[PDB]
Design a binder for this molecule. Structure first.
Ligand code: NAI
Ligand code: NAI
Ligand code: NAI
Ligand code: NAI
Lengths: 244, 244, 244, 244
């Protein structure tokens, strides 16, 4: 029970990787705020409660500062000081560089990059006064480039930059800020693809299988623990050796 | 005369690194569009003309798609197909993570990241049809983190991500896309800093001095030449060995 | 008890980081072989036994293939199949590039690089047949350069290269191979340094203090567990955010 | 004529990449020492002389300190102070990690890593007193791992480590030390492979073709010039965007 008596916000935790992260944190004893724009977040929180954990859904669009301020206020009123923030919420609006619309650019930056910043900021305001904390950002293997992902790669590389900046500003205050880059993970987004394509992606992964949400969760749980106090500003790939 | 009969757009070329880049490109025979939001860009273009080069100022705010579309239209009407794009325009609005205003976040992302995207997009639309081209993005040593630069580091890491994405999309079309990360360069932006700070930055540079605009220019000119056809998706530091 | 019923070899585990790693692995239930060239390794093993763990010292100079073959034979006779190898043993013989003697070059490469290879090889021979395993190499922040460390940086960068190579060869066989780069850790090697130097290294560490052996140990224990099955070929810095 | 009145040693310049580098340096006006263990080096030097350049073959096995000392003595007696050292000489003795013989390990480290060190050392002794110089090391895309190349990847990552170390020690003395990582280059070593295999390797290169020796040469020539004085400790890939 490595995270007993700790409070964690996981953004985008209604489903997929976020939900897997929330399960693992809950398994290790954390009180978990499921922060999501979608109301299925209530079902995710309920699922954690049914397994014996303490959990609460808070509706939040991370791209809106006032909603993010409200998320942190409410979270702390309910479960006390936020020890752990996991910035997992994100979207794709893929297109080739020459075709990408301004709207599809704007929206991906707004959620993945700005939204992540807004949450990091709220965590930082609080954590720097308490002298403790964990911020863990979910980036992507696409941060060093991927076809069709000018907006997404920009946003996720941006997240890595902020991660490293925040490490420098907050490390002396007892806070760690790290990034995880999932490789190819089995979720709803990756499942709905022709089976021939799936096999091509698998053949790019030296380990020979797609990861699960819980593989990302295990790495988050480790970075969130006291044993990872000296890991700061890192980018850890969770992709079975896969070089995108 | 490595760039004879080539047309280059250099954004942010009214002063500083951009102007140095434009000088070197002009020295190697390029026709140079000085693209800048500031009207001093006319004086910069005039200075190149007085030295014997062909040059033209076009007023442009790279954050506005319609102005960027106009920049490329006019550039091509005047000097023919754009062979080389140098995305140098950028700004700082520094602040610690816990203090950074939403406006200061927005503006830096809008210029450095989105602006760079808009220009890359216009270049890509054209260059992929011609089967030739050079895109060179000026990032920063701050892309892997720097105190006070949550917004700036996000934006510049983002530029690195897009650079690598564009390399993957465009390399087979005979186009290279690379990034230069200047370290500490002597310009108007770095000169207007307390003298105590300047000395701290100098002591971080193994070479023992601040670089000049022309040092960045020389690297741009090399990447722009036919001899660098096989360099693609690279991040080259021009910082006298400086590890930020 | 994440490593119950697992057998681990930790090279260089008589003292310092190696001994800390061995403690943490033992705490999580592993049977630990203390492999070291120094006979104080018997005391380290005894200390683990006195705390309730199973542990055995085996004398070994990792630079000698025949001794490494003997280490693995004996280890397996005593505690059964080796599930985990931690290549921690290493030395410094620092000197500026222009002064470094051939003997001091030879010895550092022989231990840090070749020794690590020999042990990796023995682990690989066995692990690839069993379809399971963990190899964790202790590299150094010096792998991307450090004054006075031509031989050491060469050796540790070399270790990173082998780590990534081995990930590619072994991942499909259910084995992970990862590297940890400690930053500045408080051990016998770092304590025996002029006090003026110590203070300079501390001022480079954003966290504000030198790490302990157990900080490296916690990261090893995580990578050795089933929860890190999808982390492969990584280089994880354990240095309180320190950029050397 | 960017390198007029400069003296360059290129190791391994009897054929392949080394010979291409020597051609480009000679084209830009350098006096070139072809340093090689093979006597075909005399023919390579003769070929440069027939094109109008000044060139000299010196027999040298870079793994032997006394021969390297002799190489630098003779080179300077013939063509005056060595301004540029290109450490290109290297070998492969590939094998899987579990099969690699001790002899094949030893020989690759001895040539690629130790040999490169010995030459760097001789250059450094001289260049640090003169207050000027260029060292350019040919590494490989394999430095971040490649199947069957435990020894080669170790050796080439090692070269990158030394490169960065030497940058830190020598930058303040007006010397730059950089590394080039060729991707997939058309030489005698790469030509002797079944044509079906070659096409698979080509399809992994975003640029869509294999590089030539002269592509590496162009990058060396640039780094060797005065225009690259502010590039130091860099690893530049010359591989058409190819991520190994
Ligand atoms: N699927 C994969 O294999 C990989 C995923 N990632 C990243 O990991 C993270 C999780 O991805 P998945 O589970 O695959 O995605 P998903 O789409 O299954 O889940 C995303 C969740 O975030 C929420 N969300 C979206 N926009 C939001 C906003 N503005 N405010 C609050 N919540 C919002 C959604 O409602 C949803 O519940 C994302 O950041 C994704 O980009 C990175 C690499 C690979
Ligand atoms: N000076 C340094 O040490 C470093 C500079 N950089 C980057 O290099 C680039 C140039 O830097 P400096 O010359 O120091 O900057 P500077 O501030 O001296 O000049 C920047 C130029 O860019 C133009 N510009 C700004 N926003 C624009 C827009 N939206 N549209 C069109 N033009 C615009 C400005 O009008 C100005 O002419 C910037 O992107 C900067 O972030 C990166 C690392 C270090
Ligand atoms: N302390 C620090 O801040 C850092 C340490 N490291 C690395 O961490 C590892 C451990 O370092 P410390 O515990 O600080 O050093 P240490 O010198 O205190 O302990 C080294 C141990 O390894 C053993 N060893 C040396 N050569 C050997 C050989 N040929 N065969 C078997 N055993 C051998 C020694 O007998 C000793 O027991 C080393 O590889 C070192 O390079 C890396 C970065 C920072
Ligand atoms: N061919 C390729 O695609 C790639 C080559 N490289 C590296 O680039 C460099 C040149 O490669 P190639 O031209 O293909 O090699 P090559 O095998 O065609 O030529 C290498 C030259 O180095 C010489 N040499 C070998 N050992 C020596 C020693 N101990 N002292 C002095 N000279 C010695 C040989 O006699 C030969 O003339 C090597 O370091 C190689 O590992 C790296 C990545 C890809």
């Amino acid at each position: 029970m490595a995270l007993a008596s700790k409070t964690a916000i996981v953004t985008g935790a209604a489903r997929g990787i976020g939900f897997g992260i929330a399960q693992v944190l809950a398994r290790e004893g954390a009180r978990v705020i499921i922060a999501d724009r979608d109301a299925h977040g209530e079902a995710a929180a309920a699922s954690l409660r049914e397994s014996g954990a303490q959990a609460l859904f808070i509706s939040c669009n991370i791209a809106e500062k006032t909603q993010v301020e409200a998320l942190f206020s409410q979270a702390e009123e309910a479960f006390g000081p936020v020890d752990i923030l996991v910035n997992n919420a994100g979207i794709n609006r893929d297109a080739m560089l020459h075709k990408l619309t301004e709207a599809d650019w704007d929206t991906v930056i707004d959620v993945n990059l700005k939204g992540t910043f807004l949450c990091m900021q709220q965590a930082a305001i609080r954590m720097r006064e308490r002298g403790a904390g964990r911020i863990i950002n979910i980036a992507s293997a696409s941060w060093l480039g991927n076809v069709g992902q000018t907006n997404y790669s920009a946003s996720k590389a941006g997240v890595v930059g902020m991660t490293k900046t925040a490490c420098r500003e907050l490390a002396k205050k007892g806070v760690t800020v790290n990034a995880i880059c999932p490789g190819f993970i089995d979720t709803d987004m990756t499942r709905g693809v022709p089976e021939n394509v799936w096999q091509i992606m698998i053949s790019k992964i030296p380990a020979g299988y797609a990861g699960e949400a819980k593989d990302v969760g295990e790495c988050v749980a480790f970075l969130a623990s006291d044993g990872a106090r000296y890991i700061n500003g890192e980018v850890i790939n969770v992709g079975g050796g896969m070089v995108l």
